[PDB]
Amino acid sequence: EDPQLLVRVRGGQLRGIRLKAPGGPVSAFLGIPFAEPPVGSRRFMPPEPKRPWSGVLDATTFQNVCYQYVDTLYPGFEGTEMWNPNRELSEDCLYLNVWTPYPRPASPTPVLIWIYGGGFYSGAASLDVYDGRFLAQVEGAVLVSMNYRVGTFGFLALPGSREAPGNVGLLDQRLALQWVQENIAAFGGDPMSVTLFGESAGAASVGMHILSLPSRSLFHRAVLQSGTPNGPWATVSAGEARRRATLLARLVGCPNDTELIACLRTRPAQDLVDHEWHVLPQESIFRFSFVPVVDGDFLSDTPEALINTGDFQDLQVLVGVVKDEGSYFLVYGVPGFSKDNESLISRAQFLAGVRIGVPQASDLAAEAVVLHYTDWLHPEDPTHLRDAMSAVVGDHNVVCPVAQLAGRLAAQGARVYAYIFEHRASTLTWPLWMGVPHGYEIEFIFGLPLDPSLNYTTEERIFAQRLMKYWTNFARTGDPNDPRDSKSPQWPPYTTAAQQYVSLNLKPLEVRRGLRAQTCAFWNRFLPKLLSA
Amino acid sequence: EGREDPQLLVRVRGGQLRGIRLKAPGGPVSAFLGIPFAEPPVGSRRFMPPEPKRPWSGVLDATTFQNVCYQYVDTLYPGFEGTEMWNPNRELSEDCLYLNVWTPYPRPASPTPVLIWIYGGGFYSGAASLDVYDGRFLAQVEGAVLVSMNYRVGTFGFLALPGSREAPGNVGLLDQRLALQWVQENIAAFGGDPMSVTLFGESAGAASVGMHILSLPSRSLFHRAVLQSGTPNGPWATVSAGEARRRATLLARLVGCPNDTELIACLRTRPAQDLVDHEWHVLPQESIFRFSFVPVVDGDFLSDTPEALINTGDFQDLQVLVGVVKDEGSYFLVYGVPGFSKDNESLISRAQFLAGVRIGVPQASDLAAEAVVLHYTDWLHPEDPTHLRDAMSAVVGDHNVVCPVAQLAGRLAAQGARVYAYIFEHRASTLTWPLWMGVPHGYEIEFIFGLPLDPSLNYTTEERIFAQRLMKYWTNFARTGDPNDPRDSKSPQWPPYTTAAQQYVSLNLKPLEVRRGLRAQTCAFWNRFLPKLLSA
Numbered sequence A: 001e002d003p004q005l006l007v008r009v010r011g012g013q014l015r016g017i018r019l020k021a022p023g024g025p026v027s028a029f030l031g032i033p034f035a036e037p038p039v040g041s042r043r044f045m046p047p048e049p050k051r052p053w054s055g056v057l058d059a060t061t062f063q064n065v066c067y068q069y070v071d072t073l074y075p076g077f078e079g080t081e082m083w084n085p086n087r088e089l090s091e092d093c094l095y096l097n098v099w100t101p102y103p104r105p106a107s108p109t110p111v112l113i114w115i116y117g118g119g120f121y122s123g124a125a126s127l128d129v130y131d132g133r134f135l136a137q138v139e140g141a142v143l144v145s146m147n148y149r150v151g152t153f154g155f156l157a158l159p160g161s162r163e164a165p166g167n168v169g170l171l172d173q174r175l176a177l178q179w180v181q182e183n184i185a186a187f188g189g190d191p192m193s194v195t196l197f198g199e200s201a202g203a204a205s206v207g208m209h210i211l212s213l214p215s216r217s218l219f220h221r222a223v224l225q226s227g228t229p230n231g232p233w234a235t236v237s238a239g240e241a242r243r244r245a246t247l248l249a250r251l252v253g254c255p256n257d258t259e260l261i262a263c264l265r266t267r268p269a270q271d272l273v274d275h276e277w278h279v280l281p282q283e284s285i286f287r288f289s290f291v292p293v294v295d296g297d298f299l300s301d302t303p304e305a306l307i308n309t310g311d312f313q314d315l316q317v318l319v320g321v322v323k324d325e326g327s328y329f330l331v332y333g334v335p336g337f338s339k340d341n342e343s344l345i346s347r348a349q350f351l352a353g354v355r356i357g358v359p360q361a362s363d364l365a366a367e368a369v370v371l372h373y374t375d376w377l378h379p380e381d382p383t384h385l386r387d388a389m390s391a392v393v394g395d396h397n398v399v400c401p402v403a404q405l406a407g408r409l410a411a412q413g414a415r416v417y418a419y420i421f422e423h424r425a426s427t428l429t430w431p432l433w434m435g436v437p438h439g440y441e442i443e444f445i446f447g448l449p450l451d452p453s454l455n456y457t458t459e460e461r462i463f464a465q466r467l468m469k470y471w472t473n474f475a476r477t478g479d480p481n482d483p484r485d486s487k488s489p490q491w492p493p494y495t496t497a498a499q500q501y502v503s504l505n506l507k508p509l510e511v512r513r514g515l516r517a518q519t520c521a522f523w524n525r526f527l528p529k530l531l532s533a
Numbered sequence B: 001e002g003r004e005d006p007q008l009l010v011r012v013r014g015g016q017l018r019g020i021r022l023k024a025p026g027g028p029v030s031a032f033l034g035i036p037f038a039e040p041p042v043g044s045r046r047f048m049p050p051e052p053k054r055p056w057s058g059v060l061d062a063t064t065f066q067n068v069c070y071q072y073v074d075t076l077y078p079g080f081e082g083t084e085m086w087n088p089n090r091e092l093s094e095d096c097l098y099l100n101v102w103t104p105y106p107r108p109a110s111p112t113p114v115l116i117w118i119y120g121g122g123f124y125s126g127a128a129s130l131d132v133y134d135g136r137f138l139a140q141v142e143g144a145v146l147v148s149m150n151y152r153v154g155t156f157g158f159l160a161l162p163g164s165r166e167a168p169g170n171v172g173l174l175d176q177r178l179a180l181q182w183v184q185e186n187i188a189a190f191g192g193d194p195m196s197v198t199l200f201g202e203s204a205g206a207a208s209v210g211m212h213i214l215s216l217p218s219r220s221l222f223h224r225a226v227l228q229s230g231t232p233n234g235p236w237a238t239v240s241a242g243e244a245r246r247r248a249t250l251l252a253r254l255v256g257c258p259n260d261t262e263l264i265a266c267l268r269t270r271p272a273q274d275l276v277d278h279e280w281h282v283l284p285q286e287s288i289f290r291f292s293f294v295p296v297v298d299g300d301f302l303s304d305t306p307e308a309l310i311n312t313g314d315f316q317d318l319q320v321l322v323g324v325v326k327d328e329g330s331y332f333l334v335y336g337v338p339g340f341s342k343d344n345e346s347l348i349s350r351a352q353f354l355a356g357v358r359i360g361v362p363q364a365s366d367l368a369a370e371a372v373v374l375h376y377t378d379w380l381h382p383e384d385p386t387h388l389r390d391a392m393s394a395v396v397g398d399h400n401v402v403c404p405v406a407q408l409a410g411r412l413a414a415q416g417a418r419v420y421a422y423i424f425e426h427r428a429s430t431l432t433w434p435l436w437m438g439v440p441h442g443y444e445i446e447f448i449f450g451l452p453l454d455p456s457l458n459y460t461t462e463e464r465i466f467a468q469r470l471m472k473y474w475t476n477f478a479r480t481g482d483p484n485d486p487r488d489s490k491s492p493q494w495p496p497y498t499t500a501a502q503q504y505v506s507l508n509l510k511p512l513e514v515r516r517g518l519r520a521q522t523c524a525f526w527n528r529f530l531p532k533l534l535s536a
């Protein structure tokens, strides 16, 4: 048998599989357990390290996807299904994946760790868009991705209780990270050069590892694509988590914390998923029922508090957004919007849409939003009202939280690089009005255009290769700039003074200044004073 | 009579007048200056509505400007032309209710459209006799009949104890109205057409014009209206009855007059100068672009607030011309905002900007103030002194003039009026204020009146041509309700302002350019959002 495909890790022996990439083979080790299955009475509990095994464990296939809600809005539609679980659902889902070049690296090689997104209620490391073979083959990287518990199973919390202390899904991630420290050298990885990257909820997870001390010895650099630990959707207070859990329990017939959690533990998985969405306090979009909680433990204070006071001198961060962050969410509840027409909306529908997109807003706060985003030269034009609705959602939930994070990190000594991703895929199945939606940079970072069967353009292939190089160069050095290329133009560090960032698209890098500066001043500076009164 | 110019003798309702033959660059004009239109509002008549002038005997000499109404005189920059040109140029007196008439020489054959000028000056100052209001150029070049009147200002014109008989308020506006009635009766004697009367005025003069539009008994007295950098709506042009009463009661205390009858009777014993000396001490907050004694919402001259009145009115057959200059706010900054001077660049700090906003928006709560600061800050360069200086100017200009105008143009258009809007962007080569002030409040006036036609004034040839264009627009509008020339389709057109398209034009050396949206985004802040905020 192939000795390249055989590895001994602390828990026992593994057999991987030789996979084909367009320019050569890669070694893949898929479905490696990093924890005891969090089932039965381990539901809602922190993960425990996997017990050693006998013989040779088969690591040639993806393991099960963590139990989660499955999307039904557009059945059979490629643009939604590409995010749906592509393996069997199970609470037994704590496994990770490793790609390395074939043969395994001669020298200790920088490690990239992918943390998938999905609103803390969905996602899996087995999706096609997270295929690590391209980065491994082309850039010679060691790539790791783990599954972590989502929804109630990962984030249901009765703060203070022993049996549901919250944030266990984040603890799953942390265990996977510890696993990398202990075992990655056997694959050729360098545990002293570990870069986390993630998107949406994944980016916010990365952010929370930055902000949580026990995670700090497990990585060296971070990438946050379209998501932040701060902001309106990524965390909840202990009181609001307690409320939601208690509500969900009542909804499923349960019933002290111990009694309540015991009854929840007897409920079949889908019974919990059936009521997951019924515990949000307001009708809303870009809000998720079970997300990380400010527990005073994993998170000692709010992300905002923690980014304001931190010391980040030896940290390097790459952060960014896509061109149309908000468009994807509108078709999931805002009247007037559909992937099947041009979604031209009235003025009235725009005011209604705002109460949904900013569900915490007072009447006055919502008025401020409407008045800010209305183009008063064309206050009733449906095309603008549509594009503004999208902008309200994108800015409130991604762009401005990102601008706030970038600035706090830079000011606190961190080395920050910022981007905006503006290329819309030729193969994109969503309508034109949605532009470049949340999530559609990922396929380019992972190098999917290199797969000739996917029908991307030749320029898109060249573009994907550029992005893979930025990301890996960042992983190697904390600087995305090619140390060979002497004719660029260079990607400068984001600073509070100059506020420089770059556009990523088919044209060469362009340097811009101010990331929605005026509009984010409204969100980040004015609106809080308004709600505080 | 006998051996005098037979073209200079005219009779009006109150008696015979002798006028003067004046030289304009292109030929002579007739002037009749210091024609009384009211009984002197002195003594027991102070604070009272004006009474029509009683007929005189003999030929009244009307060859010189009469007294300027008693008023505060500016002392900020002594000897400086930039300020002096606005200061009284005749003796101050409470006996000041006179008006002036310029007509072609000889007087016109057929009835001629009449222009009536109402000066500004914050309702505390001004005079129709000033050099920048010289009607000879419009009379000579355009053949217009021009009329300007003195009206009472400050305490004498606007001190009010609402509901009382002895100080009902707004008497300064009734002076104006009385002069408008005088024109209806008498202007035909000078060759003027009382059926074509166009009001125009600047700043508080503009606001005055707007108040005549909003007050029924003035409506039979004119046909068209021009409002230059001022509106009856907005934060400075009116006060409530409650606030007017509070200010009058305070000023009374300050001068030694602690029901309404006895208070006012004590005030009438006070020397005019005593009232002026305490006028500024009754403002409720440290402020700029605020004036102590202004028109009051009395339920009489003004049946409701101007805001309410422009919201609900029918303005079907009204044609209006409105507009602003490029830098409405700059002039006011040197009269109160620390950091600002005509004698340096006035580059200011962020702190000074925050302090300036509280003064420039004196009625703002802390939250509203912060909304202002956040809106006007440049978040790419939030500490930049040049930007902060220019933003301070924009705050004051937008809040007080540009957005109230936008609001007025919008409401009047929506209610059936034909509206024409402009921005005036040319800075006089002769301006004595520093460059950073740009095109300040009041500095289009000298062009509308045609002062650059006076060769002794050192304007450029382009400015001379420019001035003639503006005179054409104004007089065409007076004549027809349209500033465009029907014998000049070749020249670019000035479209009406509409809610749908929001068109206005640039006024400078270059041919008319059409722009859309009168600071639409920023004015949505001032006009739509800020009132909601102050409510809570």
Ligand SMILES: CCN(CC)CCNS(=O)(=O)c1cccc(OC)c1
Binding pocket: A083, A117, A118, A119, A122, A123, A200, A286, A287, A328, A329, A332, A438, A439
């Ligand atoms: C992996 C991230 N995306 C790609 C956009 C997959 C979907 N997850 S999501 O968080 O973006 C999302 C979208 C729509 C409605 C949602 O709440 C019901 C949540």
Ligand SMILES: CCN(CC)CCNS(=O)(=O)c1cccc(OC)c1
Binding pocket: A209, A210, A211, A215, A216, A217, A218, A219, A220, A221, A311, A312, A313, A314, A315
């Ligand atoms: C020089 C300061 N040290 C030691 C006091 C603290 C660590 N500083 S850091 O910038 O390397 C950093 C900060 C936060 C999260 C991190 O993820 C690894 C890394």
Ligand SMILES: CCN(CC)CCNS(=O)(=O)c1cccc(OC)c1
Binding pocket: B086, B119, B120, B121, B122, B125, B126, B203, B289, B290, B331, B332, B335, B441, B442, B443
């Ligand atoms: C009517 C002519 N103007 C200048 C346009 C002469 C000054 N008068 S003012 O009202 O514009 C003004 C300006 C600055 C500071 C002020 O203190 C209150 C008052």
Ligand SMILES: *[C@@H]1O[C@H](CO)[C@@H](O)[C@H](O)[C@H]1NC(C)=O
Binding pocket: A335, A336, A337, A338, A340, A341, A342, A343, A344
């Ligand atoms: C788009 O589709 C949805 C439902 O399919 C509908 O509610 C909306 O009115 C449509 N918009 C247009 C452009 O007709």
Ligand SMILES: *[C@@H]1O[C@H](CO)[C@@H](O)[C@H](O)[C@H]1NC(C)=O
Binding pocket: B338, B339, B340, B341, B343, B344, B345, B346, B347
């Ligand atoms: C300009 O002059 C004023 C008044 O003397 C002063 O307060 C301000 O500091 C000066 N600013 C500059 C730029 O020197």
Ligand SMILES: *[C@@H]1O[C@H](CO)[C@@H](O)[C@H](O)[C@H]1NC(C)=O
Binding pocket: B456, B457, B458
């Ligand atoms: C115009 O120029 C002459 C040149 O001597 C000067 O004397 C005069 O003062 C100037 N005009 C004005 C109003 O300053």
